Design a protein around this nucleic acid. Sequence first.
DNA 1: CGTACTTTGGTAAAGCTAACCTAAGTCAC
DNA 2: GTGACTTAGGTTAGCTTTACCAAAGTACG
Lengths: 223, 223, 90, 90, 138, 138
Amino acid sequence: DLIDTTEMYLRTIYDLEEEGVVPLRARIAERLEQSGPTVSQTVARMERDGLLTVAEDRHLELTKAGRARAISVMRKHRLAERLLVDVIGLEWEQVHLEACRWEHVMSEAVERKLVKLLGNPTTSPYGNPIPGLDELGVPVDTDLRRVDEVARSGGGRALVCRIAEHVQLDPDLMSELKKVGVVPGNEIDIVAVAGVNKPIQVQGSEGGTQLQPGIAHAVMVRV
Amino acid sequence: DLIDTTEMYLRTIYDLEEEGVVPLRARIAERLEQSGPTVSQTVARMERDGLLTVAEDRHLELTKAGRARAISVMRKHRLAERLLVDVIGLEWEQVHLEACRWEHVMSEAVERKLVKLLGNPTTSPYGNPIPGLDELGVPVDTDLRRVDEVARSGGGRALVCRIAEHVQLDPDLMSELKKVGVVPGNEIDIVAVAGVNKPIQVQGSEGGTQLQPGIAHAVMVRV
Amino acid sequence: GDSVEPVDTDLRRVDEVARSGGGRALVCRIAEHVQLDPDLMSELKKVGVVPGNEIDIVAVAGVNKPIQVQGSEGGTQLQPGIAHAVMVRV
Amino acid sequence: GDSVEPVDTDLRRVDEVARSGGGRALVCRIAEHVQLDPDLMSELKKVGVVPGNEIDIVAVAGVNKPIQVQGSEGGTQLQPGIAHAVMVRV
Amino acid sequence: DLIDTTEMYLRTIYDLEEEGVVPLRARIAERLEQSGPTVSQTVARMERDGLLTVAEDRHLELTKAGRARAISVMRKHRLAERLLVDVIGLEWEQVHLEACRWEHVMSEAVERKLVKLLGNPTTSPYGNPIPGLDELGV
Amino acid sequence: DLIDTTEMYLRTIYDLEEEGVVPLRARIAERLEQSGPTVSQTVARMERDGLLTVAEDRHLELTKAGRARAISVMRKHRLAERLLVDVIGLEWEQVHLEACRWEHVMSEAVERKLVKLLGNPTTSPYGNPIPGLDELGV
DNA sequence: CGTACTTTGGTAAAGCTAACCTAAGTCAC
DNA sequence: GTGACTTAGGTTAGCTTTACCAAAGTACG
Ligand SMILES: [Co+2]
Ligand SMILES: [Co+2]
Ligand SMILES: [Co+2]
Ligand SMILES: [Co+2]
Ligand SMILES: [Co+2]
Ligand SMILES: [Co+2]
Ligand SMILES: [Co+2]
Ligand SMILES: [Co+2]
């Protein structure tokens, strides 16, 4: 199902850092759809093997070996997504799900060949930076703001830059986003909301759609 | 199901000692009908709490605290079996199954009252010595031989003395033994067999029946 | 359901009898909630608040006030929750 | 299935061709078992035992004897289990 | 501690009905000495398995299956108490605490032997009627 | 290590059939480097799930369902080998080892894309026919 | 004597539900 | 301002199957 539990626990912790969410075990349970007790027993197993530590506030920190392995998996994931879009031509909504499995079986040898083939790519098809390209042997994004925060600050027009791994997990949503035109490199009109946990309305080039608070929080734009 | 897992592990180790079987985790698995991994994880939990230790040959030794607790449960069991037979009048074949649960909820206070009520009993209705009577506040058995070994040594007539807890778990078998007359304080004729893993034939006062090698090993007689 | 709806409709709770102006009553039922406190049950037996014995319920005024009772061999103070859980025939 | 029961019935195993009295043959299939040893595969590519290349199979006598093959750019010794796993057209 | 959580929640709701108290989750928390979240979670598990329902006014109602099981536990409880007083001679004040555990391991087979032994008892030693004697067939 | 135990037993039996070797549990032990007891236990599990049967002469026969799954694994393997050689340019001797893992995570969706991309390949880079192309619908 | 498989008793990893907890927040009256 | 319940994130105990191991024994040719 996960193919590799450890790598997916490491990559879920990485995803949560990228999305500016506090990596609790409760996050890993929700996202990988596993029981609390399973997450604790697996995180305990990974703590023993020195891939992470559990702090006093019970948030998960990656060790030097952990962060290295997390980046390695995430690099394979986004080079996989690039290969499937640029060369193979797998449909936009199906790519992440495929890459979710591929990231666990790709050699560093193949990654090197893919960097050459894909012309030294720096971002996934979903606009996410590809890390760990230094390890293989091969931009100021502090101006980016989350669609939820933009909406809560009065909304306005914005350029779509990143869709998080979280959002990519739903093929039917990604198909909706593509048809209305909420994809990297397209403009959107974010409608203003006052309430937290309220669905944000967005208008694309070919219509508009509703984003849930956790989805909108995981879509980054430039206004 | 077991009501108390720890107490049943302790009592299973005690049963195996009484039957002269090496107490391995594999014995607990097949007897309490649990998986190998369950037994190891639970025996690990009881080792941590100092109720037993796993030797080099991987046989289970009860600690002083474990042996005390084991005896306490086995005392409650056999006093319960006495009460259900002598006073309540529950059918011979149903008594062990009832006692299997009662042994986990009975207080020492009730045991003391049962000792007075039952007239300081020293044996269960299945002829098994009642231990730990010293702890509450209250015979040479070296001449006994196992029905399997009696048959393998040439057979002959013998007096039924004990039926182990192992055998009592099968109500239909206990109903058969009772009707045939293979019960404590009854004579039987044990027919001769040559090889191990062979079913032993036995003749009672009201017919005869077949005993499996593990059943025959658990029935002790005086020739 | 004799347990929840008694067939003897003239069964009353000690607290209700106390608040309505006391009276002499036969003790009938002690609920499971009362039995949970061994020290109290010892005290109820000593003074004679037990099924089959007559008791005197002292008249009380207000809620949350302890109900005084007299048994054959002494008196005792019942908490409202306890008094409620004891049923009598007047 | 062309995989297990080839449509081209003139496909033969290098070890069977060797024991039959050698011969010049076109290399067609290298089984997955052979591919599992990277060092051997490098040696097969170097000497030219690869699909589409002709090779000379040297005649052998007896079982469990290595099969000598000559490629376009050198020769190499195949173990019986390897030679068995390589299929050729004579 | 409780021996069987489900049986102790059922019988606790049965107790509150006997005492004419409104059976809320708050009452179970108090009497079984468990936190509010624990009681909510367990009641939900028992609702899921169709042993009770939570009304609009939030009082717990036993279902047909829930009431049947509650009656079975209480019947074992009050028969155990009669055995413990009339036959075994355990002290009057300690007998309930024993029956609190025995009520979970007693078979209907033993219940029917205890009915014969105690001479068809209709009440506990504390005067509480023994329910569900019809269901034993005695 | 194997990524998927079941798929590597199926394909290993399939390999032995291509090589005209009798597929015994002994052959799987040798080739997957696992103990005899391990292979017997896993084969027994795969027999229980109806992927194969153990004949009287003790050779492993794939079932209809087992052959269908073996063909699926092998088809993904040989399409991956083609992508790795023809498109990605991974070294000829390293490609099987990579395809050994890729064959377990490739969707039929990607298989159909690779068939278009590679121009309807019928053989692997090592000349082995690609089975079950019918089953993709290509 | 060698080959193939079985019996026996383990192991670690990766999942589960039931049943308990605290801290902080909501919600109706 | 309580009394009742919920939200959020844990915990231990006690189960499971899968998938690996080695030592020793069996079945057979
Ligand atoms: Co992705
Ligand atoms: Co993944
Ligand atoms: Co017994
Ligand atoms: Co027991
Ligand atoms: Co009681
Ligand atoms: Co209880
Ligand atoms: Co290959
Ligand atoms: Co593989």
